[PDB]
Design an enzyme around this catalytic site. Sequence first.
Site, PDB file in Angstrom:
ATOM      1  N   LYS C  76      -4.959  -2.146  11.606  1.00 27.62           N
ATOM      2  CA  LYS C  76      -5.114  -2.388  10.159  1.00 27.62           C
ATOM      3  C   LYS C  76      -6.768  -2.547  10.613  1.00 27.62           C
ATOM      4  O   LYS C  76      -7.487  -2.901  11.235  1.00 27.62           O
ATOM      5  CB  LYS C  76      -4.805  -3.502   9.937  1.00 27.62           C
ATOM      6  CG  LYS C  76      -4.533  -3.333   8.010  1.00 27.62           C
ATOM      7  CD  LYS C  76      -4.035  -4.640   7.348  1.00 27.62           C
ATOM      8  CE  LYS C  76      -4.319  -4.718   6.325  1.00 27.62           C
ATOM      9  NZ  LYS C  76      -3.602  -5.548   5.014  1.00 27.62           N
ATOM     10  N   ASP C 157       5.285 -11.851  -4.124  1.00 28.58           N
ATOM     11  CA  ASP C 157       6.005 -10.798  -4.746  1.00 28.58           C
ATOM     12  C   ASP C 157       6.605 -11.620  -3.122  1.00 28.58           C
ATOM     13  O   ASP C 157       6.671  -9.637  -2.957  1.00 28.58           O
ATOM     14  CB  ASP C 157       5.292  -9.702  -5.072  1.00 28.58           C
ATOM     15  CG  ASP C 157       4.020  -9.948  -6.010  1.00 28.58           C
ATOM     16  OD1 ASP C 157       4.769  -9.055  -7.339  1.00 28.58           O
ATOM     17  OD2 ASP C 157       2.553 -10.110  -5.889  1.00 28.58           O
TER      18      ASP C 157
END
Lengths: 48, 66, 239
Positions: C76, C157
């Site tokens: 990443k 979330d």
Amino acid sequence: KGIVLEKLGIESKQPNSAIRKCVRVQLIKNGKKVTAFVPNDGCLNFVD
Amino acid sequence: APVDFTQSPAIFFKPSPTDAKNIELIGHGTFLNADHSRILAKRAILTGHPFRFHKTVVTVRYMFFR
Amino acid sequence: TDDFRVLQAVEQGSVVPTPLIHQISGSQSGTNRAISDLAKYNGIDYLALKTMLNRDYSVGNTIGVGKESDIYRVMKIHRMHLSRLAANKEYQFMSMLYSKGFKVPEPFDNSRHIVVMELIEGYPMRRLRKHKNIPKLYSDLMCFIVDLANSGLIHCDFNEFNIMICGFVVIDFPQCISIQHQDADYYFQRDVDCIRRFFKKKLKYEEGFGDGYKYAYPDFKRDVKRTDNLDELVQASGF
RNA sequence: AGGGCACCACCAGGAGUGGAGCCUGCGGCUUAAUUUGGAAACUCACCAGGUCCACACAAUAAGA
RNA sequence: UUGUAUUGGAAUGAGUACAAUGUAAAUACCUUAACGAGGAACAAUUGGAGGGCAAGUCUGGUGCCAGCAGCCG
């Protein structure tokens, strides 16, 4: 007049960039030791 | 070759019995050092022809065949 | 790479005048080898990769691209200065959770705003329809929220866009907040409500929670006991 | 540092996009080629396989 | 009457030499019979052409290297 001991290259001072050709010499009349420049490029092949 | 510890001068020649002195003189020089770390690379060159041109690619012929 | 690594390490000495390349850096050969490699936003990217290339054995392939980070056993990379900060927060935050029992991808390495992690086998929860044992699965998603609240954190979330398929694993933690935040309960009930909606709508489902357990589903003032205060190791939000 | 301006900025809001199926553009993958960056032929630039085509010296023709 | 290139006769010592002169005896200088210019091969070099400081935007090579450079470069 002197006797050649050994052959050297000297790095130039900045900002210039070159390895310049020199020799160690011992003077006959004193025994003092000195470094000398050899002019004219390939001329270093003439000294030993 | 065998070593020399005196850095002797060197003379290079090839024998040639047709010559009045039986010898052909080629060159001269000096024994420098014994050093096995000297690496010698043999080199080959392949070559080809560019013939079609685009803003980011070129295509090339005749260097290879499969 | 020392001719490039020093070329970066001198960059902290601050524009940049031409003489900085002659006397700021360290000679014959060295003033030429930089060009021999150098001849073959961007440079702090295209060359800055070199650190991993040395310290880290397959270049892999492309996998994913995003608004703020790009993704390529998985690497990443973040998107001139702050990108190195964000990467460091992420690396230590994940690393910390993984040292506990939490089911998150294992981190392996981090350098120069690049992070490397384990690659997950599964598939995204949002298209699950047929799992062979949904009743236990419901229970164990519920219990996971309780654990985080105990340790001191609330996911913002926790829903099917960031769970992968107890066989689940949680794949990212955007904008997490601490249990001390003034709105902690309001976000907490959203996560519980969001997970209930999914099991009712698609799966028809509706010590543990649900059927076979004496309490139906968790509640904010229940089973929250300030066990570990992990929100102090990373000052998430709300002191 | 101050000060000014703008729904490619915000505030009050509307319609939404992002989630589903399908159409379409780019990247990547694949391939003999999937050319380059309103395509069934032609367009066409790509792939496989076929035909056909200077000047200056020596020989040749009333049938070149 | 001034430049640039095909062609023609003249002039001369560098050098060699009979002789005389010179000199203690010689060598050489001064004088002189004979000989001695057409790539007049009977071929002037030593340092330079960024500035200080007269004089090249010429043409080929090379790769911060080989090198140049009193100083600035």
